[PDB]
Amino acid sequence: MAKELKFAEDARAAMLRGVDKLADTVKVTLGPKGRNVVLEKSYGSPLITNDGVTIAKEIELEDHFENMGAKLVSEVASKTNDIAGDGTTTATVLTQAIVREGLKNVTAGANPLGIRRGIELATKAAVEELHNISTVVDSKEAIAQVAAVSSGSDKVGHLIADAMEKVGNDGVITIEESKGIETELDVVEGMQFDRGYLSQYMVTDNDKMEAVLENPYILITDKKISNIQDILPLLEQILQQSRPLLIIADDVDGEALPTLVLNKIRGTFNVVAVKAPGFGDRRKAMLEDIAILTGGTVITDDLGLELKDVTIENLGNASKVVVDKDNTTIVEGSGEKEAIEARVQLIKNQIAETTSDFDREKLQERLAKLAGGVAVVKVGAATETELKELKLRIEDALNATRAAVEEGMVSGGGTALVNVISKVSAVEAEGDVATGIKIVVRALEEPIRQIAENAGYEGSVIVDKLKNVELGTGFNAATGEWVNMVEAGIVDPTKVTRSALQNAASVSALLLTTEAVVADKPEP
Amino acid sequence: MAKELKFAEDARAAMLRGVDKLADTVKVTLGPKGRNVVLEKSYGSPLITNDGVTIAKEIELEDHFENMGAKLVSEVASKTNDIAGDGTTTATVLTQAIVREGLKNVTAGANPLGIRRGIELATKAAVEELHNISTVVDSKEAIAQVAAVSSGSDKVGHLIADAMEKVGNDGVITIEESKGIETELDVVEGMQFDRGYLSQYMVTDNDKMEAVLENPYILITDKKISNIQDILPLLEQILQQSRPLLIIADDVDGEALPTLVLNKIRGTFNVVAVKAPGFGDRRKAMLEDIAILTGGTVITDDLGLELKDVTIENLGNASKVVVDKDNTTIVEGSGEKEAIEARVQLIKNQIAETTSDFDREKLQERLAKLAGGVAVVKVGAATETELKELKLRIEDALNATRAAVEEGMVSGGGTALVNVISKVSAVEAEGDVATGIKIVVRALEEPIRQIAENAGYEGSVIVDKLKNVELGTGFNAATGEWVNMVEAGIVDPTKVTRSALQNAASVSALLLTTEAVVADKPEP
Amino acid sequence: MAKELKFAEDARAAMLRGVDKLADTVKVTLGPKGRNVVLEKSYGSPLITNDGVTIAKEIELEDHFENMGAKLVSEVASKTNDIAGDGTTTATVLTQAIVREGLKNVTAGANPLGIRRGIELATKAAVEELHNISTVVDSKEAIAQVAAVSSGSDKVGHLIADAMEKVGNDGVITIEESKGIETELDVVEGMQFDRGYLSQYMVTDNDKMEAVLENPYILITDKKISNIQDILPLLEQILQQSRPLLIIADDVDGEALPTLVLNKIRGTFNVVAVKAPGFGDRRKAMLEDIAILTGGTVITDDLGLELKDVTIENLGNASKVVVDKDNTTIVEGSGEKEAIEARVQLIKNQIAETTSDFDREKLQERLAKLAGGVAVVKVGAATETELKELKLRIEDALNATRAAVEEGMVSGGGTALVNVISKVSAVEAEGDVATGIKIVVRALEEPIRQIAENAGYEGSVIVDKLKNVELGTGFNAATGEWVNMVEAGIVDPTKVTRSALQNAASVSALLLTTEAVVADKPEP
Incomplete structure (x- = not known):
């Protein structure tokens, strides 16, 4: 049926609008202090939830190109929600930030291929750093502990x-x-x-x-x-x-x-x-x-x-x-x-x-x-x-236990993401590659800033203070106190964070290089 | 149903608009550094691809005359996509360039029959030159190498x-x-x-x-x-x-x-x-x-x-x-x-x-x-x-191996097309025949220029430098360095290029002589 | 159902508009150097052709009066396409010219019955002159030659x-x-x-x-x-x-x-x-x-x-x-x-x-x-x-061979039509009869002028020069050189030309006398 061929920035403008709509609907649930979102239902009482994946699934936009953006980001989150239950949201936030800043930079020249190359290099360096700093979980006692966290009651730890x-x-x-x-x-x-x-x-x-x-x-x-x-x-x-x-x-x-x-x-x-x-x-x-x-x-x-x-x-x-x-x-x-x-x-x-x-x-x-x-x-x-x-409770506990067993354990609450900023900034590049490196460096602060804002604390202050504290100490959004996340139990699987980062980076690279969008014309 | 008979120039204007839409949708995927295009699907996630033939197939325009142009160019690409997988794109680019410049010249007089004669003469001379300069592939080792390129892994070379x-x-x-x-x-x-x-x-x-x-x-x-x-x-x-x-x-x-x-x-x-x-x-x-x-x-x-x-x-x-x-x-x-x-x-x-x-x-x-x-x-x-x-991987490797066996091997990345410019310019003609010769000479630079633009390099600079370098040395769009295409492996079958050129020239000649367009009037 | 009764001139105006649309769609294919026309098809690729009869068959106009004129002219061409394959086009051009000039003359008085009488007299004189000047084809060698022209390969000549x-x-x-x-x-x-x-x-x-x-x-x-x-x-x-x-x-x-x-x-x-x-x-x-x-x-x-x-x-x-x-x-x-x-x-x-x-x-x-x-x-x-x-190839060769056998052979490319202008002008008449005689004299130049224009040559120059050259020498549209058509093989059967002229004159006379048009009102 009739197509709506559109090129240049306006296609990317619609893409960004759709992605921004989905991100503004999803990211509000990020973090322990996340707020609740109301979803419509055909029958019965409406469902109120702060579960990111369900809200992302329920989203469908009237504008065709914004619908394209929503479906794309949803399919990205699809590759990640399989493990744990939080990796389906951080990916969306990172994708939104990267896409926005990259589009703004591309509008002023900045050959998109260089931006994609820089994004890939920064993502590779970040993944390497994440695999570098991590608490390897291989001891039986540590495995039992991880089986005894999340929900994990207490008996599930020993059982697992x-x-x-x-x-x-x-x-x-x-x-x-x-x-x-x-x-x-x-x-x-x-x-x-x-x-x-x-x-x-x-x-x-x-x-x-x-x-x-x-x-x-x-x-x-x-x-x-x-x-x-x-x-x-x-x-x-x-x-x-x-x-x-x-x-x-x-x-x-x-x-x-x-x-x-x-x-x-x-x-x-x-x-x-x-x-x-x-x-x-x-x-x-x-x-x-x-x-x-x-x-x-x-x-x-x-x-x-x-x-x-x-x-x-x-x-x-x-x-x-x-x-x-x-x-x-x-x-x-x-x-x-x-x-x-x-x-x-x-x-x-x-x-x-x-x-x-x-x-x-x-x-x-x-x-x-x-x-x-x-x-x-x-x-x-x-x-x-x-x-x-x-x-x-046992299902997700087992899933997280296996995820920790394979990769390991790192600081939760997005602290790990900031902890690798220095290594990414240490990557040497020039031109649009360096521009993409700076893009990723700026975007990596989005999860922690968003979590801080959802709890009402100023995001920039949290970011600045976190950049100057000892490794392993982050921000507890639940209490507003700067404690040891490992000691405080605010820990997230390495696999979840690295998978979210990889998916977000890859899909943002694909979207930034888009030049022509073909969509069905709305029927009058 | 009811017809909407249209004559003179604005019919050709609508045909040109349709061809331009199709070319702007397709040509962005040309070259190794081609950018991606998003296609809508009735069910499931949208497909993102840089394959030219699929995108050309999926295009359908609401305007009937623009739809006419799109269907014409698609049927042109149909005769060429059979061999290899890239000849279905260069044909579209050449067709767009020739049609645009020819329409502009015809608007200022320039009896179209002379233009068609000149286009045919230039195309014949170019085909002769392409058959002249070519690395004949008949040795067993060369055949194995060609079977060992494209995808061709390595074993497929010896197997083929x-x-x-x-x-x-x-x-x-x-x-x-x-x-x-x-x-x-x-x-x-x-x-x-x-x-x-x-x-x-x-x-x-x-x-x-x-x-x-x-x-x-x-x-x-x-x-x-x-x-x-x-x-x-x-x-x-x-x-x-x-x-x-x-x-x-x-x-x-x-x-x-x-x-x-x-x-x-x-x-x-x-x-x-x-x-x-x-x-x-x-x-x-x-x-x-x-x-x-x-x-x-x-x-x-x-x-x-x-x-x-x-x-x-x-x-x-x-x-x-x-x-x-x-x-x-x-x-x-x-x-x-x-x-x-x-x-x-x-x-x-x-x-x-x-x-x-x-x-x-x-x-x-x-x-x-x-x-x-x-x-x-x-x-x-x-x-x-x-x-x-x-x-x-074996299928296209075999197809390309046969195509090289019958015709031969020439410089890839459109370098061969520029390499024959001098011979075409050497053809003697007068009046509209000479005008068509100049038309073809100008249009032959479109593939290399477009490839350079897709990689972010200035097309005019690349064309001018290529016109003054030794034969066998072209531009590597992947790296931006002037190396030997044969040594670097940037090689394309002679048959693909010559078939694309012949189809584009023939169809452009047919379109330029169009005088009245009979289309189905849209139903209110 | 409901009628839309219209009288006087605007009824004839719509007659003329429909006829003009059909003629502008058809006549561009006239002559050896005819240009191509694009026709829509419901399924498959659109068909591009320069065959007049097919295009005339495919034409259908929304305006009921213009569809009236189109169907009328198509039925005229029907009586003529049976012999050869070119008499279905010249008839339309002659009909358009005669109708246009006759309508203009009638607008300023000029009792239409006198116009019809003059048209008939001129047509009868032209037919008599055509039967006068002709190369009679009755010898076996000439019959074989005519069987060896058109397509006729060479063996078909002797076979027929x-x-x-x-x-x-x-x-x-x-x-x-x-x-x-x-x-x-x-x-x-x-x-x-x-x-x-x-x-x-x-x-x-x-x-x-x-x-x-x-x-x-x-x-x-x-x-x-x-x-x-x-x-x-x-x-x-x-x-x-x-x-x-x-x-x-x-x-x-x-x-x-x-x-x-x-x-x-x-x-x-x-x-x-x-x-x-x-x-x-x-x-x-x-x-x-x-x-x-x-x-x-x-x-x-x-x-x-x-x-x-x-x-x-x-x-x-x-x-x-x-x-x-x-x-x-x-x-x-x-x-x-x-x-x-x-x-x-x-x-x-x-x-x-x-x-x-x-x-x-x-x-x-x-x-x-x-x-x-x-x-x-x-x-x-x-x-x-x-x-x-x-x-x-044998089918049309046999048809043309029979057509030449019965009537004979005359100069092709419309040269015969101009060759009879003098005899028609020699016909004595007064008033509207003389006006119709002048109408036919003017209109008889249409085919050759149109053919010359399609080849890019000025029609008026060709007509004037042809009126002053020796009989048997005309204009070769393919080469632009004034040669002997009989020697050059540009020959058209006498029957085709005379039948086209008779049909065009008769239908033009019928249309010029129209005063009231009853048409089916378009359904809202």
């Missing part, structure tokens, strides 16, 4: 520590609702592999986006399922059994996939299909591993098994299966322990025999995935409200 | 070199996804002939526009298939076998073609029908060759075989068949090797016996197609993302 | 010459596509009669408007077919045979005609019904002749044959049947040669015996149709594109 120790750093930890009143930790045989659902229609938990199956049947095959006729007898058998079905195949497409989607939507079948992990000869390796764990059989042409000949017996079984957008987790497979042990010993022998470091690494991955098991946290509480609150 | 040698210059090379982690080259018995699909509805790969069939049945016949009843028993047999079907007939039309199209759309039948290559007595020659290669039988009235009497046995078989818009490729035919060898020997005897150079050439074409085989590149990589990236 | 000698001047010549690479001429037994199809729905070749049947069944009967039930058994028999059916009857109407039209549209039956040539006892004469030539039997009440009793055996057969809007052609009838010879001898005896010159002429027509046969030109070429181009 023990589960982590039992399954390792990369071991799978699962959270369940115990029917009792006590929260318990269990380690069972399970499999998680990086294969999400083929479609969102078969998601069981819309809020968690995850697909949850309880005591499901598991279909294991290396073949491609493009025809629904190949599985109709098995579908009828499972419908007779009235149990959920998990499908692990090379690919499910064609007419079978829409048919299964329609059946799931209508509730006829509680079926989930995911792609088979691994490729080539490797795929059959952990296909056989899954078959051993679940007690099922891999349906492959090598064994002479056909899809139409698959019965209930050949299907794998497990207590619970969780499928997210990218990974599928199996809990308490029904296969024999001795067979799993024999497979583990075979993989160990292969590792001791293989000479390729790549093949050894793949076999080690299979061995660790098979032998580490799955940590199960059966949360128990007196009331369903208490159980749900504890579940939510 | 070896397949290029094994199948010859015109030999068919195919790219496949190996299930393993290594990319391998294979030469098998195959057949590619210039016969595309009869319709776009049975296209299996929409992105590649190609029709892909895996282990399909092949129907070989010289008869015309206008009735679906003639093939219903065979259709039912193949549906029972649930395999793809390839139809090679003189012509499939009437009611059978829409029926097959509907069946393919509904997914009932994976059938593709193409015309039989060759005509007269010749057609049966490669028909029999295809039957021998695939193990099938040609259904012809000479042999007493009827379409309704065709069984599964008489059908040809192959591992894979690829059908593009214009050609159909057969991979790993199931016919006997000895029969193919006997056919090859028969064709060789015919060649040694035939006295007509035309008939000898046709027999040589058949012999080369039968004996050269098909090069199969089974791409292997660790991940599907890696496999797809490698596949895409 | 030999076919024309073999079949005579009025003999039927047919063009076919040979499966080989060589074009061949064949003379076979055939039949063409002035009876077109009963409706356009059974037209097989939409582009050529002709109905083409290959090896069809021929129904020959003198009865009137108004009931579809009379032919249902034969229809079922032919459907079993799956062959085309040709129906030759007195008249096909009632319910049978819509039923056959629906069957042909649905593709159930490839049936074409045409009226029987001749009337009274004469109709049965060439009905029996067709039966003899095709081997069929005439279904008539005299023989006691009923329509429901017609079998496949009684149907005539031929290799090919071509049915245009006005004539039906039969190729290679299956009847016995001896029976045809006996019929020919009977007709010759009747001719030698008949005493009525009218009856003798009719019998001679039958004899010539039976004995002259049909020339078949089997065009052969290497590629289908070459075959189609050669077919199109």
